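Notes, p. 3: input format for complexes.
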Amino acid sequence: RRGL
Amino acid sequence: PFVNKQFNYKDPVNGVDIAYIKIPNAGQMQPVKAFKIHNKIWVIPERDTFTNPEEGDLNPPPEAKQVPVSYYDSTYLSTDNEKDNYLKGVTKLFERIYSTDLGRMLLTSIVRGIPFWGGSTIDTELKVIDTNCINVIQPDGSYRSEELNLVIIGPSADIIQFECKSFGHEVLNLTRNGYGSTQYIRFSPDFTFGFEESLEVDTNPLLGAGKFATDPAVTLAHELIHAGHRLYGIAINPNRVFKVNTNAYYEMSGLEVSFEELRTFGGHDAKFIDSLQENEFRLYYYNKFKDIASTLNKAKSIVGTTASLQYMKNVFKEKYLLSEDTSGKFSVDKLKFDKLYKMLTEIYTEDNFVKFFKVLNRKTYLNFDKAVFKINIVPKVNYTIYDGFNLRNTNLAANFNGQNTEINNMNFTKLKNFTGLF
Ligand SMILES: [Zn+2]
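Output follows (426 residues plus zinc ion):
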């Protein structure tokens, strides 16, 4: 997941 | 090449590597056209409304109720041309990844990482777990079960929420018990993210418009790294997190980031996981590998007629790099376990891929996205297996000019700004  | 055939979405189905398939989502679905681009690896050019039945709606909720940092477009990936471009884009990224020594190593590990045959209730028999398979429609219209390790599928409603999804087991935690499970990666090669060249700007939620674009090969590699962890059943439980205390903006909101993500990014981020919790995980997974070796020893028969017991026991001997004594008994060698575990967790990292691709990229996972851009990497005049956006012998070759959305503006269309919305 890329995240913020 | 990693993908020997250059599939066109409209190529006629053959029931082998171009076929209509159904996935084990414990629900009902119409078959979807899929392409097998490599042994154990398939691509489904469809928005993912299948792995999660509760996420079959692509339409965006009311504007006043949208998670502000996200991107919706119910029409994306609905036409044949889009699917054709999606297939070619994903294929190109696999080739770009495979063209590097690190990528070749990772993809080899992924292909060898066959989900463990632990679906038997009788310890004396070895059986496959059906959710690590897909049902392929054969030429005669019948269905055949095919084991696979990886599926690349389009994103669900929120287009930029890329992630690894896999089917769970009633009791077994497949991605954390050494077994592994088929990984479905929600991903799109048609969009990318903007980040900032200055660390103090990139890690600030109020600054920057996203001058540089992330190379989608890095984004895919990041997911492939998670996939590697999950296929070998060594993913870190998402409840194990780092209560960020190195960024005031994260800290003031009590934001937490999973160790699994920090490990995957690598570099200095990986150091936020203290030696004690890391020795803990290493021992935990070492023991899980021990149980696998034990289960294999107790196996006396195999279910099915596709492969022999000896063949499958050897498949897993190779996957887990087990040792076989004089009695043919399997055991886990500490040196070999540590070597493999380290390979999957420390060698395969986003930071290392950046070094191999020679691209500009976020310096840490602990930052704030600036924007999302629409891109098209299929045309060689836009992006290549060898140089990504930074095309050699052009004005885009140096200083990451190809990733510079201001210099190479013809290759990026900003769809949404995220700065100031966190
Ligand atoms: Zn991630």
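The pocket of zinc ion is lined by residues A 1; B 222, 226, 261, 264 (CB under 6 Å).
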